[PDB]
């Protein structure tokens, strides 16, 4: 992209490990600023790099180090990772003449106690109730993704092979299945509402698709259960003349 790019999309690590995050500024920008954003907070400034120098640094300890290369691209290295480092890490680029800081898409870091805390979602679709169809002439399907950790999934709906946005609402935050515990798994729901006539056509195919961000090949895995890799999990229903 000629926009701000970052890699990787996500990282899952344990305490004490280290990470390097990468940023390329937007074409035409020469300054990069890194920020940490916790849930419910504003982005907190880590440092800014121009002409390969750290020009400003925010309230971040020495385990956050940075670098900017001659081609303007940048790295953020964090070591001796702590559980509290779990956050969205944002890169923003700017130039010396304009009023424009623009953010990249971010890298989500989870630092967890053990990779055995990582689980992919299970996904199920629940069919509209005949009571609703007869009461409203509308049909609501619910998709439920449960049991996942870390808490980043993206949920989409697909009707007869086409992604749909109309009639959809997905919870903006996953909910914690075990509120009282640090390594609680998560759930997320989404609804798709269609006319009862559309649901009542048995040729109509509805599929809830959940992208999970999990482990890769670089992660060791020696549990019995399947390695909880980055994956998509779907569920489906077909329409019915009831």
């Amino acid at each position: 992209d000629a926009g701000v790019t970052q890699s990787p999309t996500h990282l899952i690590k344990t305490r004490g490990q280290q990470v390097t995050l990468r940023c390329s500024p937007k074409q035409g920008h020469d300054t990069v600023s890194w920020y940490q954003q916790a849930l419910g907070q504003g982005p907190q400034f880590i440092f800014q790099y121009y002409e390969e120098e750290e020009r400003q640094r925010g309230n971040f300890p020495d385990r956050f180090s940075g670098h900017q290369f001659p081609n303007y691209s940048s790295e953020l290295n964090v070591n001796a990772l702590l559980l509290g480092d779990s956050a969205l890490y944002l890169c923003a680029s700017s130039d010396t003449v304009s009023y424009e800081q623009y953010f990249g898409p971010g890298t989500r870091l989870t630092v967890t106690e053990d990779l055995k805390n990582v689980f992919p979602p299970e996904v199920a679709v629940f069919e509209p109730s005949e009571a609703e169809i007869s009461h409203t002439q509308k049909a609501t399907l619910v998709c439920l993704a449960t049991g996942f950790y870390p808490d980043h999934v993206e949920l989409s709906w697909w009707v007869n092979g086409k992604e749909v946005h109309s009639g959809v609402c997905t919870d903006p935050q996953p909910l914690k299945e075990q509120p009282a515990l640090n390594d609680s798994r998560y759930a997320l729901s989404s609804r798709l509402r269609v006319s009862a006539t559309f649901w009542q056509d048995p040729r109509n195919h509805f599929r809830c698709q959940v992208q999970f961000y999990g482990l890769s090949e670089n992660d060791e895995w020696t549990q019995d259960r399947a390695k909880p890799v980055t994956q998509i999990v779907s569920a489906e229903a077909w329409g019915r003349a009831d």
Binding site: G42, P43, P179
Partner: protein
């Protein structure tokens, strides 16, 4: 801290004027920004301003008062798609980094034309034994309460828009794994409209 705004959330009726404010402490601040951040995404720049007065951009107006050290964002004709966290940022002096406030969550709330509050039970398409409860078609004044019981899960309210029929509806979902659970029980924790439909 350097940049102040309230978290909210703040609700605004669909179509009405949304107003957000931010104050800042450094009298040498020279540029001022509003960003918008939807769920799961990065902040997007929506406006910048650097001299006193108003700047208009479609339905957005930013206002800056350097003597009083505030900046405001006004949103005309508020849309459901305007629901987001809005973040103000200030740059003191030239080329510095942005200091962000904490963000204000804004919820744009539709008027429900024909409230029809109901709780329905939905079965899993893959086995009858598992199900979910759907509280739906309630008006925008109905609060949905977080569950008491730790084995019962209740989502926040969400608004869906069936765009081709210009139809909006609120819903919340609840579910549990204990059998003791019934959808009549499900949303009791919430003050529910008295006219609520409960077929099964």
């Amino acid at each position: 801290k350097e940049v102040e705004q309230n978290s909210g959330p703040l609700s605004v009726p669909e179509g009405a004027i949304a107003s957000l404010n931010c104050t800042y402490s450094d009298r040498g601040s020279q540029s001022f920004f509003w960003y918008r951040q939807y769920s799961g995404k990065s902040p997007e720049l929506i406006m910048f301003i650097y001299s006193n007065g108003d700047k208009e951009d479609g339905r957005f107006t930013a206002q800056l008062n350097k003597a009083s050290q505030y900046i405001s964002l006004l949103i005309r004709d508020s849309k459901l798609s305007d629901s987001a966290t809005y973040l103000c940022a200030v740059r003191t002096n030239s080329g510095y980094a942005l200091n962000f406030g904490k963000g204000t969550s804004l919820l744009v709330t539709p008027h429900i034309q024909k409230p029809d509050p109901a709780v329905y039970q939905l079965r899993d398409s893959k086995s009858s034994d598992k199900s979910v409860c759907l509280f739906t078609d309630f008006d925008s004044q109905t609060n949905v309460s977080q569950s008491k019981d730790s084995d019962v899960y209740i989502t926040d309210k969400c608004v869906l828009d069936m765009r081709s029929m210009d139809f909006k509806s609120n819903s919340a979902v609840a579910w549990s794994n204990k059998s003791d659970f019934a959808c009549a029980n499900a949303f009791n924790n919430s003050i529910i409209p008295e006219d609520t439909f409960f077929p099964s």
